[PDB]
Amino acid sequence: NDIDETAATIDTARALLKSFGFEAQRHNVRSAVTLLALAGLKPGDHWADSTTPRLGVQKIMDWSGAYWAKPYATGSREDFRKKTLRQWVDNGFAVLNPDNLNIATNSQLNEYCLSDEAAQAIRSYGTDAFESALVDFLSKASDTVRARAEALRAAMISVDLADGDEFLLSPAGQNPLLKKMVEEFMPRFAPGAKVLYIGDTRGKHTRFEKRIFEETLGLTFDPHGRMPDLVLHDKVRKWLFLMEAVKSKGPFDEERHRTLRELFATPVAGLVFVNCFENREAMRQWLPELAWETEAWVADDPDHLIHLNGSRFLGPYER
Numbered sequence: 001n002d003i004d005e006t007a008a009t010i011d012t013a014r015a016l017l018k019s020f021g022f023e024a025q026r027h028n029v030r031s032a033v034t035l036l037a038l039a040g041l042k043p044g045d046h047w048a049d050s051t052t053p054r055l056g057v058q059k060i061m062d063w064s065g066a067y068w069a070k071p072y073a074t075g076s077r078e079d080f081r082k083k084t085l086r087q088w089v090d091n092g093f094a095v096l097n098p099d100n101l102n103i104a105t106n107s108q109l110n111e112y113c114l115s116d117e118a119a120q121a122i123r124s125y126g127t128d129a130f131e132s133a134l135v136d137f138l139s140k141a142s143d144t145v146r147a148r149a150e151a152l153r154a155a156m157i158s159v160d161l162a163d164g165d166e167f168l169l170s171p172a173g174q175n176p177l178l179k180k181m182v183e184e185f186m187p188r189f190a191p192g193a194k195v196l197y198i199g200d201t202r203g204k205h206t207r208f209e210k211r212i213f214e215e216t217l218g219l220t221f222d223p224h225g226r227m228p229d230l231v232l233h234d235k236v237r238k239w240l241f242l243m244e245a246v247k248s249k250g251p252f253d254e255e256r257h258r259t260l261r262e263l264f265a266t267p268v269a270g271l272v273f274v275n276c277f278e279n280r281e282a283m284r285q286w287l288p289e290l291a292w293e294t295e296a297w298v299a300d301d302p303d304h305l306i307h308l309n310g311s312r313f314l315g316p317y318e319r
Contacts, residue, residue, distance in 0.1 A: 003199065003227050004208040006048060006126035008041040010068060015204065016047075016125050020093065020118075021138065021149025031084045033070050037063035038094065038114050039122060046210075047125040054098055054111040057081055077108055085112055091141040093118045126207070128165040159183065161195040161207065173202035174229075174245035180299040181230050181243055181276050188302060190234045190241055197231035201245055218266045228252075228260065233269065240264055243274045246286055251275040257291035 005012055010032045017027035017035060025031070037060040039050035055063070057080045065071035072080075088094035089112075096105060098113045114122065117140060121133040138146050156168040159179045169175040178201060186193055196213060199206040212233070213219045217240075221227070232241040242260055244252055252260065252273050264271055273294040277283040280298050283306075290296060296306040307313070 001204050002223055003197070003206055003221060003225060004046075004126070004210055004223060005204070005206050006046045006208065006210065007223065008036060008039070008045045008047055008049070009043075010036070010070075011204070012047075012125075016122065019125075019149070019152070020121070020134065021141065021145040021147075021152070022087070022091075022093075023148070025083060026087050029070065030076075030079065031088075033064035033068050034060055034080060034084050034088075035122075036068055038112060039119075042067045048123050048127075050114075050119065050123050052114045052116075052119050054113045056111045057085070057108055060112075081106075081108065091145050093137070093141070128162065128207075131166060132164070159198070161198065167195075167198060167207055169200050169205070170202050174247045175201050177245040177276060177278055177299060178229055180302075181245060181297075184299060184302045185243070185274070185276065185297055186232060189297075189305075190232050190239075192236065193232040193234040193241065195230070196233045196240075197227055199227060199229060201229055201247060217268045219264060221263070225263075231264075238269045239272050240269045241272045241274060243276055246275055246277055246282075251286045251289055252291050252294055253289045254291050257294065 002009065002012065005015070010029060013032035013035045014027045014029070017031055022031070037055060038053070040053050041050060057077045060080060061072040061076065085094055089096045092115050094112050095115050096112060097103065097110045099111060103109050117137040121130065121137045124130040124133040138149055153168055157171050157175060157179055159167045159169060159182050161167050161182060169178065178198070182195065182198070194209070194212070195207060196209040197207065213221070228242040229245045230243040232243065234241065242264060252275055257273060260273070261271065273291065275286070275290055275294060275296045277286070277296070277298045279300040283296060283298060290308055292309050294308050296308065298304070
């Protein structure tokens with residue numbers, strides 16, 4: 001599944017729409033292709049590429065058939081209008097009849113576009129600006145949509161990736177450990193580092209700094225590849241910390257170490273591998289599998305590190 005949620009797909013469009021606080025019927029496939037059409041997006045595009053064209057229901061349907069392999073018959077026109085666009089318009093997500101022509105609000109001649117508020121939020125999806133942009137939209141939405149969006153977030157844990165940049169995770173799995181990796185490990189051992197990748201350990205939600213990876217570091221990825229749970233870039237030391245919130249899937253062992261050394265190979269930054277655990281008790285079962293030339297960190301003894309291997313440790317005694 002996609003490491004990059006700035007990539008526009010039907011699946012991310014549905015996730016985006018759920019995130020805005022819509023009910024299931026306004027974040028299904030029909031509603032997803034409607035958003036992709038109203039945003040002017042095609043496979044390969046990213047949310048930042050979104051535009052705000054004006055479209056009638058037929059053209060939304062044509063756009064879906066052309067680019068998203070979801071053709072619709074003329075008889076689905078009413079569904080688009082009454083089961084997607086109506087609720088969007090009511091919540092100020094879409095604008096009905098932006099040309100402001102003198103036509104009935106229920107007419108299939110109406111065109112639609114995304115509101116300025118929805119658009120600014122949409123364009124920021126998958127980035128550190130999204131949550132702040134969304135506030136502006138939500139302040140104008142229906143009370144129920146606002147309540148739904150608020151409750152989804154209240155039931156998540158919040159991780160401070162940087163000043164003013166909170167990343168939300170479900171409370172499940174090793175997400176509490178991941179929060180500690182960011183909030184306790186980083187300030188101690190890599191303060192000021194930028195989070196270039198973090199992925200929900202139980203969900204599809206990620207942050208992926210594509211441009212920095214590609215333009216700064218010269219790195220590209222399998223869009224559906226496995227990643228370390230957390231990648232930090234310390235630009236003073238020119239290091240990438242590749243870090244794992246070790247779950248049943250296991251640690252950086254010898255194979256993963258080799259694989260990741262290749263994946264993240266660049267002359268712009270050296271690699272530091274850290275396997276993370278909630279405590280040494282949890283680390284026990286993975287101990288024999290940890291790759292040499294890696295570190296280990298346990299959240300309940302956060303000032304310490306366990307180093308598996310090198311010459312840097314073998315200096316002579318200085319009396």
